[PDB]
């Protein structure tokens, strides 16, 4: 009941939201281009263990985060996924790889993060490198829909709680412009959408990178604000 919003989170700190059985966000602020913005990652319950997705957009969140896990959830984080390059993906990998965690990636997240001068995850995901291509993992499915809002962004489902995570490449339904599109791929981004939209009618809620969850329209509501940031 009520998703935390960005004036319910001080910079620092971490909250979560159960989503679904064994399915919870997390959520967490930070500065950034002169404005405070809110973050959600993924943590979803694998057996007796958490797999974890994204990071909390840095090391000190992302420190606030593990802690969060352990008080309001008490299993341990023994794997992560990032689902792009940015910092608030992988910002805060280095305090997961200090807990035990291990972190994934897929081998272009990993060079992209490289280049970019990013904390890089550890081990690279395997048969996500190409526009469609999909694979389990643990509890998960990752989605690789094509270019987006990063040219490597992947999508997170879980089939067990028909949960729907789109990290950067989802806005959420208040949001009007299309965000950072400094790496995006502006063209590419509605077949992409479109992708995710045929891969998964089933989802019932949709969880964006920043802000409110919803239902499926906010893929639709992503392919509209995109193609009007397109057009100026
Ligand atoms: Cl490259
Ligand atoms: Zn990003
Ligand atoms: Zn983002
Ligand atoms: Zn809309």
């Given at each position: 009941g009520e998703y935390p919003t960005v004036s319910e989170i001080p910079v620092g700190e971490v909250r979560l939201y159960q989503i679904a059985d064994g399915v919870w966000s997390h959520i967490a602020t930070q500065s950034f281009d002169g404005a405070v913005y809110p973050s959600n990652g993924l943590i979803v319950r694998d057996g007796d263990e958490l797999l974890l997705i994204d990071?909390?957009?840095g090391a000190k969140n992302t420190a606030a985060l593990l802690a969060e896990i352990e008080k309001q959830?008490?299993?341990?984080?023994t794997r992560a996924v990032s689902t792009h390059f940015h910092d608030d993906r992988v910002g805060g990998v280095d305090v997961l790889r200090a807990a035990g965690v291990a972190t994934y990636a897929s081998p272009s997240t990993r060079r992209l993060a490289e280049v970019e001068g990013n904390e890089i995850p550890t081990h690279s995901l395997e048969?996500?490198?190409?526009?469609g291509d999909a694979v389990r993992f643990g509890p998960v499915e990752l989605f690789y829909?094509?270019?987006?809002?990063?040219?490597d962004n992947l999508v997170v489902y879980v089939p067990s709680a028909s949960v729907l995570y789109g990290g950067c490449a989802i806005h959420e339904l208040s949001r009007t412009s299309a965000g950072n599109?400094?790496?995006?791929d502006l063209a590419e981004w509605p077949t992409s959408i479109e992708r995710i939209q045929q891969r998964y009618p089933e989802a019932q809620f949709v969880i964006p990178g920043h802000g409110l969850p919803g239902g499926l329209d906010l893929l639709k509501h992503t392919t509209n604000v995109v193609k009007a940031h397109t057009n100026r």
């Open positions: 990071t909390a957009w959830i008490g299993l341990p984080v048969g996500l490198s190409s526009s829909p094509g270019a987006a809002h990063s040219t599109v400094a790496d995006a």
